[PDB]
Amino acid sequence: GMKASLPNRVMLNAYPDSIDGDLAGTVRMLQRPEFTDAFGLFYVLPSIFNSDLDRGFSIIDYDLNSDLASAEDLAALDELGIMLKFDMVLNHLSVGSPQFQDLLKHGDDSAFRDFFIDWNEFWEGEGELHADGHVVPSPEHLDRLFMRKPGLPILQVRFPDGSDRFYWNTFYQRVETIDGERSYLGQMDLNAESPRVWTFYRETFEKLARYGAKIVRLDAFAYLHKAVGDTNFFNTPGTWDHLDRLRTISEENGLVLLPEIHGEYGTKIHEELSDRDYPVYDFFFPGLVIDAIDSASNTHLLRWIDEIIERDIATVNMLGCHDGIPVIDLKGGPTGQGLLPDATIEAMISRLLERGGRVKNLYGADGTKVSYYQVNATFFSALGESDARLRLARAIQLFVPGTPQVWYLDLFAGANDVEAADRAGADGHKEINRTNLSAADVEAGLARPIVLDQLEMIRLRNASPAFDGRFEVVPTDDTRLQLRWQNGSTVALLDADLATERFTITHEHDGHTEILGYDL
């Protein structure tokens, strides 16, 4: 099964240039003694490929960006025993991609005339034309539309016959002008009904497998299927049909599929994905662990831990990542109940804002905000810039079921990068949590307890066979958390106290008992 194929190793996560300018910089760091056998997985963000906008997620092609990465870096990571996780950004390609450039060059004669989505074609007979030339969907359709920005998800482009056409653009765009020249970049949505797109998916899977990929992340997968009259967020059954088709291709290359979906807990999308034998991200744990630590109570976190076991959910969990801390994910959806009460989520957002966080909301086409979505902040800052809270969150993360993803910047306890978040010309508030580190930063960090203590726990989690065995929550009062893994005679026990923020890790292996602890 695919869930069972998810490797249970600790997974590093970073941009190829997060450490000393390029992926060779991360390799050199990984070759240090402190990092020996720390990670068996590495999710390298998509700027490892040729790309422009959205720091890697506007893909030109899936060859490596030679400024930042090479096949020699991948061989060096394989030498270290590190398997790879990469994106397939299957919902869209850059305007600068060869497919879209061919569309702009040959227009209606292009072999890719059906590869992307002409907006006015898509909505033909389902809306009135705006003065600007684009089709405004009828109110019945526009209401249902899930929107990741104000206005419509369209970019106007220039075809070789001199016409201006509107192409579907759910996410980023850039429009530059001077004298007579209008240039544009953007993430142009792919037509999932096109056999050419599916041929590109298969070739891309083969390319990623050749690079040494073991996991392929289906970026923004819920947005792929589009249909007049639907919301275009996880449309069904269309989204399931696309996923099963990808699954087949994935299996032919020996790859594990991990669809990225920020569904509200109360929709139970994560349960449906798991029941269909797909691993999922754990976007509930980040907020739950903050709430558990901020309140010194395990009640909400334990409930979610119990459902992972009861529902047999294979996850990739995390503290921070390249996006913000998910908060909408904790809600109950349209009718259901969330993992934290609405009021508890909002109060957590307020605290995170007091700690320098910056909220990121969702807005409908009519401009009215729908809800908070994420909170942009480093996890170190989200926890009040306390080494003890970050050590505790890491320890809990490593003992919860699931593959633990480690954000490079949390490993080095980076605080909010306020300067980067406000810099004119930067990517905005997500920069608060994307600081690039030098080799010097790395060195100085390897003398810090907050970095070394995390690495000691990481190396244990990545190597001990205990975590390949049975998981158990040892009953305690609600201010403590005692998590136990046993594989035959090998036992790993986390005994944590949320009130005092103290904890110890006991590891029994080959009759030898060693204790990890960072307070005494």
Side-chain angles (χ1 to χ4, degrees):
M2 190 167 286
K3 290 199 301 186
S5 295
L6 184 73
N8 197 41
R9 307 274 75 78
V10 182
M11 175 157 57
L12 180 68
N13 182 29
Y15 294 100
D17 60 328
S18 293
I19 307 295
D20 197 19
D22 58 29
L23 197 55
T26 286
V27 165
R28 275 185 269 103
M29 179 191 76
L30 292 177
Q31 291 165 346
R32 313 265 315 201
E34 297 91 348
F35 283 89
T36 308
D37 306 326
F39 303 105
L41 280 168
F42 189 0
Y43 173 22
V44 184
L45 288 161
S47 50
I48 191 180
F49 311 114
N50 289 310
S51 56
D52 35 69
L53 295 182
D54 203 356
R55 196 161 179 184
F57 284 96
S58 195
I59 291 289
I60 294 166
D61 59 56
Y62 285 96
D63 296 329
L64 303 185
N65 170 8
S66 55
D67 291 332
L68 305 183
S70 69
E72 297 173 10
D73 301 327
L74 299 186
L77 291 168
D78 188 63
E79 183 65 29
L80 294 164
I82 305 185
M83 292 181 287
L84 303 178
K85 170 177 155 193
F86 299 125
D87 284 276
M88 184 162 88
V89 187
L90 78 173
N91 186 70
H92 45 264
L93 282 173
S94 167
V95 162
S97 71
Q99 298 96 330
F100 201 87
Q101 288 295 296
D102 189 284
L103 180 64
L104 298 178
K105 180 171 166 60
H106 300 293
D108 294 314
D109 294 332
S110 168
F112 304 92
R113 178 56 169 85
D114 204 23
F115 199 93
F116 302 97
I117 306 174
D118 179 322
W119 176 267
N120 281 17
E121 276 187 23
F122 188 97
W123 292 96
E124 189 181 346
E126 300 289 352
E128 306 293 347
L129 278 158
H130 205 264
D132 304 355
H134 66 277
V135 170
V136 181
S138 303
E140 61 187 346
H141 298 332
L142 205 51
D143 289 350
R144 310 182 47 70
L145 215 60
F146 193 88
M147 286 307 309
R148 286 291 294 263
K149 59 184 168 182
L152 303 171
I154 61 187
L155 171 61
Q156 183 199 283
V157 302
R158 170 62 57 80
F159 263 46
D161 64 0
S163 64
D164 292 328
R165 312 210 188 170
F166 297 92
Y167 270 74
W168 201 303
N169 165 228
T170 294
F171 294 108
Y172 251 102
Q173 64 163 241
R174 171 194 291 176
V175 179
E176 289 209 10
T177 57
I178 187 152
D179 308 302
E181 299 306 296
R182 180 179 174 277
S183 72
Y184 40 88
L185 289 171
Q187 291 161 309
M188 314 311 296
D189 291 53
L190 306 189
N191 174 17
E193 292 281 306
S194 162
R196 256 182 193 93
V197 169
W198 282 93
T199 296
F200 180 66
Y201 290 168
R202 174 181 291 287
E203 296 174 353
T204 298
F205 273 14
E206 297 171 3
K207 222 178 209 184
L208 297 176
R210 266 197 62 183
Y211 288 143
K214 184 63 188 167
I215 304 168
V216 177
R217 177 183 187 273
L218 303 180
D219 174 67
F221 180 69
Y223 296 83
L224 183 61
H225 187 279
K226 296 172 174 64
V228 173
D230 215 329
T231 79
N232 306 319
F233 181 83
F234 213 101
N235 290 346
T236 52
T239 296
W240 294 124
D241 300 339
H242 291 341
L243 187 61
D244 288 329
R245 191 174 173 187
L246 293 160
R247 185 192 178 101
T248 301
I249 304 169
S250 192
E251 282 169 353
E252 299 168 22
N253 297 279
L255 305 170
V256 176
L257 288 181
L258 182 69
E260 187 237 3
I261 306 186
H262 282 289
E264 300 198 21
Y265 166 88
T267 68
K268 298 310 181 86
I269 290 173
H270 64 283
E271 280 184 9
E272 302 198 47
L273 282 160
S274 181
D275 287 342
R276 292 173 180 251
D277 188 30
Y278 290 103
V280 297
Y281 276 121
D282 183 348
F283 290 134
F284 310 138
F285 179 79
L288 289 172
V289 76
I290 294 162
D291 173 77
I293 290 168
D294 269 332
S295 69
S297 77
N298 68 19
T299 301
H300 303 311
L301 177 57
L302 271 188
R303 172 187 161 180
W304 166 237
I305 290 170
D306 290 331
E307 295 179 5
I308 289 176
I309 305 304
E310 284 160 5
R311 304 288 307 208
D312 208 43
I313 306 181
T315 57
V316 171
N317 63 48
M318 68 192 78
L319 302 178
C321 71
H322 69 294
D323 290 332
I325 299 164
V327 282
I328 203 175
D329 305 51
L330 297 163
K331 300 176 75 176
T335 61
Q337 167 185 345
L339 279 169
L340 288 176
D342 278 11
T344 302
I345 302 164
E346 291 153 355
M348 178 164 57
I349 290 170
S350 290
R351 295 197 307 282
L352 293 179
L353 264 49
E354 291 182 66
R355 295 156 187 176
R358 296 178 185 190
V359 68
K360 173 184 165 56
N361 303 315
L362 290 187
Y363 306 86
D366 50 320
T368 71
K369 113 178 171 184
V370 171
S371 171
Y372 43 76
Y373 188 65
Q374 290 166 2
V375 176
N376 293 124
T378 75
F379 223 83
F380 182 63
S381 295
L383 296 167
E385 307 194 4
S386 154
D387 295 350
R389 288 185 163 202
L390 177 55
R391 265 189 295 265
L392 175 62
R394 182 70 70 206
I396 295 168
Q397 182 207 4
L398 299 173
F399 273 73
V400 168
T403 298
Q405 194 170 267
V406 180
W407 187 228
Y408 77 94
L409 193 58
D410 298 347
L411 175 60
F412 290 92
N416 287 336
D417 194 336
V418 177
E419 179 171 355
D422 298 334
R423 186 181 305 106
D427 291 358
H429 286 169
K430 283 180 185 182
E431 298 281 36
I432 203 169
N433 177 51
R434 299 180 172 180
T435 310
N436 286 343
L437 305 180
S438 66
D441 289 328
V442 161
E443 239 191 338
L446 289 185
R448 302 189 64 202
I450 185 53
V451 180
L452 293 170
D453 299 339
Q454 285 186 84
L455 279 172
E456 187 175 52
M457 292 190 277
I458 283 163
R459 292 187 307 253
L460 173 70
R461 174 61 177 79
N462 195 51
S464 173
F467 302 97
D468 292 324
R470 178 170 195 93
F471 165 83
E472 184 198 338
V473 173
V474 184
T476 62
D477 63 80
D478 75 320
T479 74
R480 297 182 70 95
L481 200 55
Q482 196 167 328
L483 310 174
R484 192 180 180 277
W485 288 85
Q486 177 171 1
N487 184 352
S489 68
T490 305
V491 177
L493 176 65
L494 172 64
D495 184 359
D497 189 330
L498 303 179
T500 65
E501 306 180 357
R502 296 177 57 183
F503 72 89
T504 61
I505 290 165
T506 301
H507 186 230
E508 307 175 22
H509 186 66
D510 283 19
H512 174 82
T513 289
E514 78 179 286
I515 295 182
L516 279 53
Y518 311 104
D519 304 290
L520 274 33

